[PDB]
Amino acid sequence: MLKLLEPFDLNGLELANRMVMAPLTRNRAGPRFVPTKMNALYYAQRSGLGLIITEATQISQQGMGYPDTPGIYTDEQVDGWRMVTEAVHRREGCIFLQLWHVGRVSHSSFQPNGQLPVAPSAIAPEGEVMTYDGIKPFETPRALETEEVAHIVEDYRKAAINAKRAGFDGIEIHSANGYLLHEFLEDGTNKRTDRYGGSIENRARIVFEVLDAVCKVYPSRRVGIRLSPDTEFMSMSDSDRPALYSYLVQELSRRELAYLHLIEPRIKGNVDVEKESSLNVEFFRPLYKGVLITAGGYQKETGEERLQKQHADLVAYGRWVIANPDLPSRFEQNAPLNPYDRATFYGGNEKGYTDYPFLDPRDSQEALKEAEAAERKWRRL
Ligand SMILES: Cc1cc2nc3c(=O)[nH]c(=O)nc-3n(C[C@H](O)[C@H](O)[C@H](O)COP(=O)(O)O)c2cc1C
């Protein structure tokens, strides 16, 4: 009777339910940022969510800012992802890759040749960044040249090609939470005088150039995009956030994308924040006519209410899905939720990753069986 559990038709993709695994960085890639059988098991365990969106995945080394996140820019990486999509699909799930570029939210120690992180403008974000050699203050980024934007758009296009080869059903453009594309959108961080700056249509230009490039690889109905309309995360700030996103979302709605994915302002990246705001999903439902995913702070009842009042079509759960790989079944059965342990969110191994229990141990068996079948299929002989 919960609409959270109703099957849903995402333009030909037959999702088992209306719940989404939110994208979640977990910093557990193998060498050279290559996914492992362990990551395949983690996603296979979570195959019962109607749609999985992967952890952010950098389209280049230039686009990384955190240790051991997976990439999608080499064939070695694609081959590792193949285990992930194989295992998920053998469990009859559906999975999109989230394409990432951290922009200024990085450190030269992550960058090729010790180069500075790149960004629209040379403003450092207030805060500290973890590096291979300890915590360090943020560097002033290098502002990108006009000629280098098309280069990064092309990195997205190649990443989409690689995602398709790795067997992903679709891709999600990360345009939220203070990374490169969000930095271009906002005028606390955009400070360009060329066509990628100033105008609200100039500050969104890169986002629509990325969409153009990846929609030459995937049909637009298999390309999603994620936005954080009102967050202070990673020193973000805009002069007229209501104006900025009204246009973007309205411009997005005519692009015939797979979906629009909105983060609630009550989330500040990866933690909850007490924040009153008008730019939540109720505000954007009218301004976007396609499939709308709402994310951030939901429980069973609040997520259910968004769907009943038709304020969104799909609800994404992050931290609860870390801890409850069978979250849909727990909701259907009215079962307790495993508590999430934040100390094992980032980095490490199976602990706090694949060792959260299931209601039905056969679910856990089947995920393991497909992870190991997947490795045998795609092993690097
Ligand atoms: C550990 C962790 C990792 C995350 N990684 C990503 C990410 O890679 N990309 C992204 O868009 N959001 C990421 N998020 C934000 C989540 O997708 C989600 O919006 C957030 O957890 C709030 O949703 P929730 O209340 O259901 O947990 C992450 C959040 C957490 C807690």
Side-chain angles (χ1 to χ4, degrees), residues 22-26 54-56 98 100 172 174 176-177 226 263 267 269-272 295-298 316-320 322 345-346:
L24 295 169
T25 294
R26 307 299 306 280
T54 63
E55 59 203 294
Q98 187 184 62
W100 206 18
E172 187 179 277
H174 197 284
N177 291 347
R226 195 172 210 221
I263 308 185
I267 297 295
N270 57 1
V271 296
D272 296 337
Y298 293 105
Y317 293 82
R319 292 159 293 168
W320 281 131
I322 295 185
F345 285 179
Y346 310 110

Side-chain angles (χ1 to χ4, degrees), residues 20-27 42 53-57 69 98 100 172-177 179 226-227 261-264 266-272 294-299 315-322 327 340 342 344-346:
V20 184
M21 182 183 173
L24 295 169
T25 294
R26 307 299 306 280
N27 317 85
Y42 163 71
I53 302 159
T54 63
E55 59 203 294
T57 300
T69 57
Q98 187 184 62
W100 206 18
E172 187 179 277
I173 302 304
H174 197 284
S175 199
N177 291 347
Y179 301 120
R226 195 172 210 221
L227 305 171
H261 188 172
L262 283 179
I263 308 185
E264 289 287 280
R266 63 199 206 241
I267 297 295
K268 205 199 187 203
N270 57 1
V271 296
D272 296 337
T294 187
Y298 293 105
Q299 321 289 315
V315 182
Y317 293 82
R319 292 159 293 168
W320 281 131
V321 171
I322 295 185
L327 196 58
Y340 38 82
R342 292 169 200 270
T344 58
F345 285 179
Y346 310 110

Side-chain angles (χ1 to χ4, degrees), residues 273-294:
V273 72
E274 310 312 287
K275 180 185 158 352
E276 190 185 1
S277 166
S278 65
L279 290 158
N280 59 40
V281 66
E282 292 188 24
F283 173 107
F284 287 110
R285 186 59 289 191
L287 304 101
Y288 186 84
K289 67 180 181 180
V291 172
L292 201 52
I293 318 183
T294 187

